[PDB]
Scaffold this active site. Structure first.
Site, mmCIF file in Angstrom:
data_model
loop_
_atom_site.group_PDB
_atom_site.id
_atom_site.type_symbol
_atom_site.label_atom_id
_atom_site.label_comp_id
_atom_site.label_asym_id
_atom_site.label_seq_id
_atom_site.Cartn_x
_atom_site.Cartn_y
_atom_site.Cartn_z
ATOM 1 N N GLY A 59 0.832 -1.215 0.000
ATOM 2 C CA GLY A 59 0.000 0.000 0.000
ATOM 3 C C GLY A 59 0.857 1.252 0.000
ATOM 4 O O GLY A 59 1.838 1.286 -0.747
ATOM 5 N N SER A 88 5.301 -6.063 -2.187
ATOM 6 C CA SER A 88 5.472 -4.636 -2.292
ATOM 7 C C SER A 88 5.945 -4.064 -0.936
ATOM 8 O O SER A 88 6.920 -4.509 -0.387
ATOM 9 C CB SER A 88 4.115 -4.125 -2.894
ATOM 10 O OG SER A 88 4.172 -2.922 -3.512
ATOM 11 N N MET A 89 5.186 -3.158 -0.337
ATOM 12 C CA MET A 89 5.617 -2.606 0.975
ATOM 13 C C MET A 89 5.585 -3.698 2.064
ATOM 14 O O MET A 89 6.321 -3.567 3.017
ATOM 15 C CB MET A 89 4.816 -1.380 1.404
ATOM 16 C CG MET A 89 5.250 -0.091 0.748
ATOM 17 S SD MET A 89 6.991 0.337 0.779
ATOM 18 C CE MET A 89 7.201 0.944 2.443
ATOM 19 N N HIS A 113 9.246 -5.324 -5.797
ATOM 20 C CA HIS A 113 8.957 -4.489 -6.989
ATOM 21 C C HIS A 113 9.248 -3.026 -6.678
ATOM 22 O O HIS A 113 9.075 -2.618 -5.525
ATOM 23 C CB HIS A 113 7.496 -4.676 -7.414
ATOM 24 C CG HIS A 113 7.146 -4.067 -8.724
ATOM 25 N ND1 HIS A 113 5.943 -3.404 -8.927
ATOM 26 C CD2 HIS A 113 7.806 -4.032 -9.899
ATOM 27 C CE1 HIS A 113 5.880 -2.986 -10.177
ATOM 28 N NE2 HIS A 113 7.001 -3.374 -10.803
ATOM 29 N N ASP A 162 7.694 -7.194 -11.369
ATOM 30 C CA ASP A 162 7.229 -8.061 -10.255
ATOM 31 C C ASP A 162 8.208 -9.236 -10.158
ATOM 32 O O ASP A 162 8.528 -9.839 -11.204
ATOM 33 C CB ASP A 162 5.790 -8.541 -10.451
ATOM 34 C CG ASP A 162 4.741 -7.487 -10.147
ATOM 35 O OD1 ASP A 162 5.122 -6.339 -9.829
ATOM 36 O OD2 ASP A 162 3.555 -7.820 -10.242
HETATM 37 C C1 VSZ Z 1 3.478 -1.972 -2.933
HETATM 38 O O1 VSZ Z 1 3.101 -1.951 -1.789
HETATM 39 C C2 VSZ Z 1 3.289 -0.731 -3.860
HETATM 40 C C3 VSZ Z 1 1.859 -0.604 -4.431
HETATM 41 C C4 VSZ Z 1 0.788 -0.607 -3.386
HETATM 42 C C5 VSZ Z 1 1.595 -1.764 -5.332
HETATM 43 C C6 VSZ Z 1 3.779 0.507 -3.086
HETATM 44 O O2 VSZ Z 1 5.140 0.333 -2.843
HETATM 45 C C7 VSZ Z 1 3.577 1.783 -3.897
HETATM 46 O O3 VSZ Z 1 4.248 2.005 -4.847
HETATM 47 N N1 VSZ Z 1 2.606 2.544 -3.512
HETATM 48 C C8 VSZ Z 1 2.298 3.810 -4.173
HETATM 49 C C9 VSZ Z 1 2.905 4.984 -3.394
HETATM 50 O O4 VSZ Z 1 2.709 5.127 -2.223
HETATM 51 N N2 VSZ Z 1 3.563 5.825 -4.102
HETATM 52 C C10 VSZ Z 1 4.139 7.040 -3.581
HETATM 53 C C11 VSZ Z 1 3.115 8.165 -3.817
HETATM 54 O O5 VSZ Z 1 2.700 8.359 -4.947
HETATM 55 O O6 VSZ Z 1 2.781 8.821 -2.848
HETATM 56 C C12 VSZ Z 1 5.397 7.364 -4.353
HETATM 57 C C13 VSZ Z 1 5.961 8.630 -3.784
HETATM 58 C C14 VSZ Z 1 6.411 6.242 -4.244
HETATM 59 C C15 VSZ Z 1 7.566 6.319 -5.174
HETATM 60 C C16 VSZ Z 1 0.784 3.992 -4.296
HETATM 61 C C17 VSZ Z 1 0.220 2.991 -5.303
HETATM 62 C C18 VSZ Z 1 0.474 5.388 -4.801
#
Ligand code: VSZ
Ligand code: VSZ
Ligand code: VSZ
Ligand code: VSZ
Ligand code: VSZ
Ligand code: VSZ
Ligand code: VSZ
Ligand code: VSZ
Ligand code: VSZ
Lengths: 184, 182, 181, 182, 182, 183, 182, 182, 181
Positions: A59, A88-89, A113, A162
């Site tokens: 998330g 992921s996280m 990932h 992935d």
């Molecule tokens: C795994 O947990 C990923 C997704 C849920 C599949 C997670 O790592 C992720 O990328 N989450 C994204 C996120 O928090 N992105 C932030 C943001 O946009 O605030 C970036 C700053 C990260 C480089 C969610 C899907 C927006």
């Protein structure tokens, strides 16, 4: 969610044994609950181990880092135990457990990932959002490198797409220390 | 849309007039490019009149129109009525030097482009580099068309910038305010 | 669309305008125009203007195969953007007659797909997508003079090219620079 | 859809060409059957050319087209461009023997039919029996048209089976891969 | 729904866990927490897990599977109604000799399902993961039933419905639970 | 829908006394087919009309508008089933001139009792139910007359969906011949 | 839902279970848990199951059915309002001689319903399952009523509405409970 | 819904008062039947007071309450406040003879039942015969409870029939209009 | 909010009922239950019904109205905010001499509304029911206010907004409550 009377819900009863259950996506509300449980357990006993079970698709990256920083901050060791899937996280938090006290059960899955993001609006706004996403990915890779013993170069390459690991593969990778195999 | 014995736009096309009165998307660009190629095939040497009342739209759709204007032999006059904003102001500036006009109460608006990026960090960097390169391309051509520095174009397009017809002339986006003859 | 409609009038001059996504309807229309123009005159060049984000791969191959099948040379002229299957069709023009206007963009990328249902169905869908990407890369390799290995690498992510970069890559033969008045 | 002085399809129909470039429903079948009857009435001797780019659709709509092709006197050549899948591949195999073609990059896909059945146990039994009998009929006809055994057709259509033009020829679904005219 | 403790919390007191829903991460989290609680109360006394489930998430099912094998107490499994998909997998995961179905309870075994949308390279990775997950499920079912991996593969291609007596013959359960003596 | 020089393809076939039913039967479709039949009779009251049927059926009353018009006009109406003649489609296939009802070999025919709906007060539901039962008796009586089967056999054979091959439809009396392809 | 315990929890104290809804896995999980709880409290004393239900899931119905036959205590069934579909099946499942309806209660018996979507081979498996499940329902209803399977098949083809007295004559209940004072 | 710990309804239930202030469905019937059984178990001789403000609802849900009233030993007084319409008026008339009341400005409405039937001609016939038999049953019991002929009940319920408290007493639906305290 | 009771339960202990919503069967069921409970607790002591309501169901309104007139205890009515439609009817239904409004409270009286759909014969029955219900409402408002039925009919054709003092002058309330101390 069943009740136990000595009246606790099942999670509150497990919290009495210093067990925290993560069985959902990670958002600010879930982070707030897990941080509060970690601060509570530290106030009860600053020396005794905490057990964090992780079954999570991940998330919010910043929600994850609220949990990550609270784990490293508190005096007690936080054991991490993967059941089902740490993706992921989730995988990042699994790797964040006390060195020597990161586990997966034998059929638990781990997925690593690169992070996702969004950028909308004026060219200048996109450049700022893009720079923030890039810097966040560098932060995530440096920490995963430190937690696993893998080079930054290999973490970057291995997280482009992935990447699904078995419990044994996650142990070989340095995301966990041991596979908890049945003993009874 | 009334008929003449042709629809009203088809009748005006006979006098080498093209009417842009909408947002610019691939469909609108395909129509305007086809009308420019048609008019060149009818006569390669007589002027074409492009009326522009447009809030803009697709950058790539705008460049299809822009490149077709510069490609064909006929001079393309540009005449701003109502508003020429974003890609509309870009196309206004793209008419034949000395034949770019705005009616006295027409507005011209210049602004930096917009874009979007969703997905993996690697995809977002690729999209960001593309948006930056496309903004540099737009600013370089606006600089060549207006005689303003890239530096000045960049500074003046950070936010929405509304110009009167007279201000658009002073800026070099048009050559003349087209005042009523009578 | 002024009214022959404007497209119908340009078709009289052996000009076909692609200014949309490629689906089975758009492919059916363009194939029909190519067959009509070949029947009118089997020796005269056809001019295919491409401003397209691409679309169906199989719809793209219906156009691609009709272009290589017919006797007339089909010139390709990119205006605006030739992306995805649009860049593939731009590269498919007669040798020496593939063009882009100076501010036109070209984008190459691997194909996208979907697979839903049982493991056995997902396996079949995945093998079909993999084999289709190999076919796209083989033809792009043949049309550009680039190695299959380089095409595979350069299509993994969205790859944006200027008209000049597209010429250097071998997707077009020339940038059409405006003639002096 | 451009005009010739006819829409482009009507112009090709003058040359006995029918373009299938969509899913097959009752409306599409009604149109293709009507074009086949029209072409036979114009000339019962000269070949018809049926271009197929279709994901398929209704089995009974497919059979309306299938039976019209076999009923009329003219040979119907079938030419696969893009994709002939599901009922589309069935119709490709139904062309005049020796006059079934695919362009070199055209795809063919063969698969068992799909259906639905809701309601009372007795209704589901009648629908399930109908689906099974329809699949036997399709397999019998594919066997006859390809020269493959019904057993092989049954095995090879359990899952989606994607064939290249060359594989479709080797299977007996088409006679020739059409090579360029020069 | 009713109070005595809610009815489920009252059964938990006698080391009974009721699964009467689809398996998602929330359900897995609750069943794992109950298993850990019952072990903490008594590491040596049997636990009884009733299963009426159409299944759901494979990874959520594996959270439950691994917790059952990890804890010291024997977990008896009792199928009432239906144990299908991941429900049948969990039924077969019960302590050897203590896996039961009621006489009119149904068991269904089937290969897993998935989805994948996006770039060819993403679909390949999704496809390989689903294939490897199926090999893992087949290996464990083979171990739990005494059937070969090759037989498990063949018998789970399509939906496979078993009576309680068939489920025992297969090795998914040990005994069909007969009525208590009045 | 292509053009022929100017007719749409259906208008060109209408010139040859061919009517194409390739849709559900509703009041609009019935209105069109009835108008085509009345036109074709006015053009020539002696020459056959050809009605191609590929239809899942539809409105019973819309179907009866077409049925009564077929029996009213002087010209023989040939019926030719392609694809499927189901529900009211099979009824109209059976309504063609005796000796001139046909199916192509892979065409399907399906016969079935009518469907209906009734909502509101008990008294309203009784009236709707009586109308549906009486309409079924009318359909059964005419299918009996058209096929040479007894009302009792029609009633039994249409309780549930009944799928017939072209050959089974011939044996049943719904058509006269299967039109087999000539080499 | 008033307090005294909620009203249902107070009746559970007197070994009364109230079914006043459709039967899904959640309702079955509740009623099974109540039957298990009541058996654990006292294995000899009768349980009273009031049924006002339009039915629901067949497998959810069998979870309750098998639990009734499994436990030591007799389970009396009392129909109020309507026992339809699976509700009638559960009414007939009560201890022989202790199945009742109040005088104005209705009983409705009918064949099961189902759904099958997808490939011909999937529809065949789904149809075979539905037909086998109807045979199982008919065999048990025959054992419960003393009516032949051939009569049950014929009588359940369409919705079959029975008065309380007709349900007794059919063998679905043992007695109509007539008012003793009113 | 305030507290006194009891909710207000629970507090009134302690004094053998049941409040119906809603439409009648299986849930409301389940609750009211459960309160009636609870009150009889507490004391089999003391009167129960059922307040009715209801537009009615499900006929079978209404019969579950009706038959429970006639089954239990306690007199169930009925007291109409606001409106007793459709099945509400039916239940009002089903109170202990001599102990059916309306407040002076309360409204009583009698009307034939409604229903629905969809699908095959044979299904509509069965649904129609069921609705007709149910209307005969409702009319017979209203006749028995009011002293009006079935013929008069039939005529007076064809359309919505609105009665004052005094008209409802004249009709035999209630015994008395409740007079105020001093 | 809680007191050691939710706030409404705490006020009920002091024989206060709060109506601050539309009037439907659920709200009437709750208010009738509270009146019956308070009569059973003490049949002699006054009840206090605060009314801030836009009204709602006429029959739900009459459920409350008849319960107020039936029970032995006097029910005081106190309008705060607005008593409109059936709310004004219930305000007028309080014990004579114990019907109040706060100084800035508003009262609105208006004919009832209804709906009829379907066959002509069904619409005639619904229209007659609505007309007879308006006559019933007007007769009781006449009895409660001392105004003629003819004046009530005239004054309620359209929305009629009354200040607290106009409401007292009309006979809908007895007194405007002045501040304590
Ligand atoms: C795994 O947990 C990923 C997704 C849920 C599949 C997670 O790592 C992720 O990328 N989450 C994204 C996120 O928090 N992105 C932030 C943001 O946009 O605030 C970036 C700053 C990260 C480089 C969610 C899907 C927006
Ligand atoms: C004015 O016409 C602008 C907007 C309509 C306000 C227009 O110039 C613009 O920015 N359009 C955007 C666009 O085409 N952006 C492209 C793209 O995403 O492809 C970027 C590459 C440009 C940097 C639309 C709104 C997406
Ligand atoms: C560019 O035109 C691509 C997208 C439109 C961006 C195009 O190349 C593409 O991949 N289209 C996809 C497609 O046709 N996929 C087929 C399919 O799923 O059937 C695969 C077989 C291609 C390998 C669309 C987006 C589904
Ligand atoms: C390929 O064209 C198939 C689908 C479109 C992918 C087609 O062959 C097919 O199965 N179509 C289905 C169909 O017509 N099914 C009929 C029916 O249920 O009416 C069955 C009788 C076939 C055995 C459509 C998708 C329902
Ligand atoms: C039975 O329980 C199956 C379905 C719920 C009917 C279950 O076994 C299943 O396949 N679930 C699917 C699953 O979890 N798939 C994962 C996934 O795609 O994430 C695959 C990795 C398993 C091969 C879900 C619910 C789609
Ligand atoms: C086949 O064509 C039937 C359906 C389309 C499947 C058709 O015969 C049929 O029953 N149509 C129904 C109909 O017209 N019903 C009328 C009606 O309710 O008005 C009844 C009077 C017929 C007895 C449609 C689907 C309502
Ligand atoms: C009565 O209760 C029936 C319906 C609720 C009216 C009930 O008996 C029934 O048929 N339920 C269906 C059912 O459980 N069907 C299963 C299924 O499709 O899974 C069949 C396998 C049982 C033959 C519900 C409506 C799906
Ligand atoms: C008054 O309460 C009636 C309606 C609520 C207006 C009520 O008596 C009624 O008719 N209810 C209907 C009903 O239960 N109908 C059943 C049924 O269809 O199951 C009929 C069999 C009764 C004749 C509801 C509105 C469906
Ligand atoms: C004020 O409270 C009125 C409206 C809510 C503004 C209220 O008095 C009113 O008219 N309510 C209506 C009502 O109860 N109407 C019934 C009915 O249609 O059943 C009529 C019989 C009254 C004459 C509601 C809004 C329908």
């Amino acid at each position: 969610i069943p009740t136990v009377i000595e009246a606790y819900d099942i999670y509150s009863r497990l919290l009495k044994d210093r067990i925290i259950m993560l069985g959902s996506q990670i958002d600010d509300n879930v982070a707030n609950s897990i941080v509060s449980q970690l601060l509570f357990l530290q106030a009860q006993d600053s020396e005794k181990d905490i057990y964090l079970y992780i079954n999570s698709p991940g998330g919010s990256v910043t929600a994850g880092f609220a949990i990550y920083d609270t784990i490293q901050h508190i005096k007690p060791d936080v054991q991490t135990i993967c059941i089902g899937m740490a993706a992921s996280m989730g995988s990042f938090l699994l790797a964040a457990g006390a060195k020597g006290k990161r586990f997966a059960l034998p059929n638990a899955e781990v997925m690593i990932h690169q992070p996702l993001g969004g950028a909308q609006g004026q060219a200048t706004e996109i450049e700022i959002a893009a720079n923030h996403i890039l810097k966040t990915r560098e932060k995530l890779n440096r920490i995963l490198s430190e937690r696993t013993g893998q080079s930054i170069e290999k973490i970057q390459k291995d997280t482009d797409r992935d990447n699904f690991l078995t419990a044994e593969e996650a142990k070989e990778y340095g995301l966990i220390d041991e596979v908890m195999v049945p003993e009874t």
